[PDB]
């Protein structure tokens, strides 16, 4: 959560569904009505970095609604088959946003689910990372699994696979 983390910066600017609590005047600069105000009980999508502050200061101005990524459907999908889930399709920065949402809401069950998902997928990505192709003179499963990773999983995978490749190169040099 460092200030200059590029992944954190990208994750901050993600729209989230959230209704309003006041008929606040003069807002909507790019929300389809620059001069016209924003009405009470209005459901709009707002960037997470701004919605975070707007959800605490106030009764808070904005009531955050549960996003589609953390709906009970996705929860059931995660609890069913963590390995065969294309989490990249759900979002490129799913784990960071899960961490931020849990930190804001102290929602322990989501944290318990996401930790299990992370462990189960870490097992498989380590299996793939330590698998090094050797030329007798890019496996199909490797690539078809790599597309279902967020940037952090793609980063841990790159680092671990680089370490494995360096070890193999030094060992057999």
């Amino acid at each position: 959560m460092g200030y200059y983390d590029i992944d954190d910066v990208l994750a901050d600017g993600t729209e989230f569904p959230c209704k309003f609590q006041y008929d606040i005047p003069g807002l909507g600069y790019l929300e389809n009505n620059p001069g016209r105000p924003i009405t009470k009980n209005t459901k709009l999508s707002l960037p997470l970095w701004l919605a975070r502050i707007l959800a605490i200061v106030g009764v808070p101005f904005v009531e955050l609604l549960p996003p589609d990524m953390f709906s009970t459907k996705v929860m059931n999908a995660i609890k069913t088959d963590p390995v065969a889930l294309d989490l990249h399709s759900i979002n490129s920065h799913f784990f960071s946003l899960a961490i931020k949402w849990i930190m804001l809401f102290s929602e322990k069950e989501l944290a318990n689910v996401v930790s299990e998902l992370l462990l189960q997928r870490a097992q498989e990505l380590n299996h793939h990372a330590s698998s090094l192709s050797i030329d007798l003179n890019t496996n199909i499963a490797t690539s078809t699994f790599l597309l279902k990773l967020e940037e952090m999983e793609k980063e841990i995978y790159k680092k671990s696979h680089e370490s494995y490749k360096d070890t193999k190169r030094w060992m057999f040099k």
């Binding site: 059931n76 609890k79 294309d86 399709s89 490129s92």
Partner: protein, 645 residues
């Protein structure tokens, strides 16, 4: 068989844990009992229960894993447990002297998340045999519904006793058992003659359909692959060819694969198929919703509120194809077609069709095909056709032979499948003349007739026809009358409600606006996509299987589809004298008009006016037609004919 009883008891404990299934069973039983106690009634509820896999996983992960890994040893115990539970809480009414003999096993159905078991016919590898899988596809072939014996009842007219003999097949029961020779025992063990007691014997409806993957996820250079599914009991006739569907069932294997001294070295494989347990009819090409889209009360209220908008017609027309610049009146006509006027089923065999058929002919690269593609992507029931890529036999009805039974049968064509739907025909001028008479008969009387191969039938295709056409020359010649510019008979043109002429005249301001709009369209970037990144498609959005004032410029396409469905279902407009005066006045003025000399205006134009007025009344959700409907219909027809405004 101790494991069987253990699974039965754990399943019953799970059922008691979630009483919602018990309530559903109670509702089904009381509904059936009330219908039996109540007449021209035939709607009886089935003995099937839909459970969510998520609840089973939360309760007992071992049982859920056994279900999803080796269902042949876990679902039969669950069915036994459900039957025992149903009997225990059954209202124990007076027996019919048949239900005691006619068994009624309570089928199981599943929904929710499936993970890696959500597959397609192409990806259904042999490793998934004996494993419960969910496969999406299109219904293409459907065998005839054929009942089969599972239990025969016999009466001994020397002892007054009833003997039952249960019949099992590899395609009926999941667990493998010795096949029964399907012979009725006419004699008792003690030399007593037995009479087969039909009605007390038990037969089940059986069907065998073919499910093939999407053509659009079919990989480059490969044709779609297909699998065979065996729907049984309730699931028969629940689907028809051309339906998108997701089936949940066991991937079973059958056959001998040689291995019988008939084929020792011959390398033939085994028969593989699916015993369907659940059918979910995803449709409308939205990948996750059915054609009969569910309407929430909020959506209905919003639809009613938007119906009070003055120019809701224009808003919906413009919201149809935002990426297609201009062609506003064409969009209005398309919206009228999608949700058309009333069909008059008059007496004495008279029939006035309510569908609107429009032929639009125009210059090349004028979005003629793109409009039809959009209508295909939007309409609830839309079938694509190409004039070159179509045969009349493959368009209306094909005389094939059945394989399950081995005898002749008819298969629906392109328009019969589109009954109550829309047919989008591109390259209409390129259609074969010999098969063009068939579509002429369709658009004339909405029915086809077959009198070949000892089959004399009349099928109903009450579809709405939209056609895209090109001029006889490479481009339209305005110096020539609109008869030689079209290579189609005027009788064929007559049945069309509207004929739209599209001219690609080279303007400068209009050309600039078109170019700017097209560039805005081409520079669009999908939300979850980066610049310079190929737009890959997976469409694995089935994370769970099954059901699991205001003045906006443009409404969302699914919301528009919901509005169209609600309007088609609910409002049945009535033509009004105030509309009658306007309609008759406009028809008279157009008929005896000097500029209308080149027009084919006849009595059919009056039918077109009535249909347009009814469709416009449907647009306003008014249960009766009004003057504004007639005025708008007259203006649109006058635009279609003359084009001045």
């Amino acid at each position: 068989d101790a494991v069987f009883g253990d699974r039965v008891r754990r399943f019953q404990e799970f059922l008691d844990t979630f009483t919602s299934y018990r309530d559903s069973v109670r509702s089904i039983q009381v509904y059936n009992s009330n219908n039996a106690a109540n007449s021209t009634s035939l709607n009886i509820l089935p003995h099937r229960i839909i459970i969510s896999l998520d609840d089973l996983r939360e309760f007992d992960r071992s049982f859920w894993s056994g279900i999803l890994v080796e269902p042949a040893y876990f679902i039969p115990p669950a069915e036994k447990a459900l039957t025992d539970l149903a009997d225990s809480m059954d209202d124990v009414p007076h027996p019919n002297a048949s239900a005691v003999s006619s068994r009624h096993p309570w089928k199981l159905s599943f929904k929710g998340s499936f993970g890696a078991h959500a597959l397609s016919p192409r990806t259904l590898t042999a490793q998934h045999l004996n494993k419960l899988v969910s496969v999406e596809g299109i219904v293409t072939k459907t065998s005839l519904v054929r009942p089969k014996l599972i239990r025969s009842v016999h009466y001994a007219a020397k002892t007054g006793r009833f003997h039952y003999r249960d019949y099992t097949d590899a395609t009926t029961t999941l667990t493998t058992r010795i096949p029964t020779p399907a012979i009725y025992p006419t004699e008792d063990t003690e030399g007593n003659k037995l009479t087969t007691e039909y009605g007390y014997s038990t037969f089940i409806d059986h069907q065998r359909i073919t499910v093939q993957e999407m053509p659009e996820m079919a990989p480059a250079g490969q044709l779609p692959r297909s699998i065979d599914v065996i729907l049984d009991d309730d699931l028969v006739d629940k689907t028809k060819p051309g339906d998108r569907v997701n089936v949940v069932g066991v991937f079973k294997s059958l056959g001998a694969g040689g291995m019988n001294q008939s084929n020792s070295n011959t390398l033939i494989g085994f028969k593989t198929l699916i015993l369907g347990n659940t059918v979910y009819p995803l449709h409308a090409r939205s990948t996750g919703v059915a054609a009969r889209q569910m309407l929430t009360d909020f959506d209905i209220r919003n639809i009613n509120k938007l119906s009070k908008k003055k120019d809701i017609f224009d808003i919906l027309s413009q919201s149809l194809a935002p990426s297609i610049y201009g062609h506003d009146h064409i969009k209005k006509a398309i919206l009228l077609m999608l949700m058309g006027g009333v069909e008059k089923n008059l007496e004495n065999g008279s029939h006035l069709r309510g569908d609107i058929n429009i032929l639009m002919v125009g210059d090349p690269s004028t979005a003629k095909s793109q409009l039809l593609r959009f209508v295909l992507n939007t309409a609830s029931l839309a079938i694509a056709t190409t004039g070159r890529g179509s045969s009349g036999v493959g368009l209306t009805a094909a005389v094939t032979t059945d394989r399950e039974t081995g005898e002749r049968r008819l298969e629906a064509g392109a328009m019969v499948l589109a009954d109550r739907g829309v047919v989008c025909i591109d390259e209409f001028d390129k259609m074969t003349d010999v098969d063009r008479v068939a579509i002429h008969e369709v658009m004339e009387q909405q029915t086809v007739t077959i009198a070949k191969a000892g089959i004399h039938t009349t099928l109903n295709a009450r579809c709405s026809v939209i056609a895209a056409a090109n001029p006889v020359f490479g481009q339209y010649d305005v110096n020539r009358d609109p008869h030689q510019n079209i290579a189609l008979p005027d009788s064929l043109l007559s049945r069309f409600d509207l004929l739209f002429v599209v001219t690609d005249d080279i303007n400068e301001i209009r050309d600039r606006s078109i170019s700017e709009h097209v560039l805005r369209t081409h520079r669009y970037l999908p939300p979850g996509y980066l610049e310079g990144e190929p737009v890959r498609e997976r469409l694995n959005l089935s994370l769970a299987v099954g059901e699991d004032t205001e003045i906006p410029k443009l409404v969302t396409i699914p919301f528009l589809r919901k509005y169209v469905q609600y309007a088609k279902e609910r409002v049945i407009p009535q033509l009004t004298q105030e509309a009658i005066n306007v309609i008759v006045k406009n028809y008279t003025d157009l008929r005896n008009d000097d500029n209308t000399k080149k027009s084919p205006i006849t009595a059919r134009t009056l039918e077109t006016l009535i249909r347009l007025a009814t469709a416009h009344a449907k647009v306003r959700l008014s249960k009766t037609v009004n003057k504004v409907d007639a005025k708008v219909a007259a203006n649109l027809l006058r635009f279609a004919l003359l084009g001045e405004d």
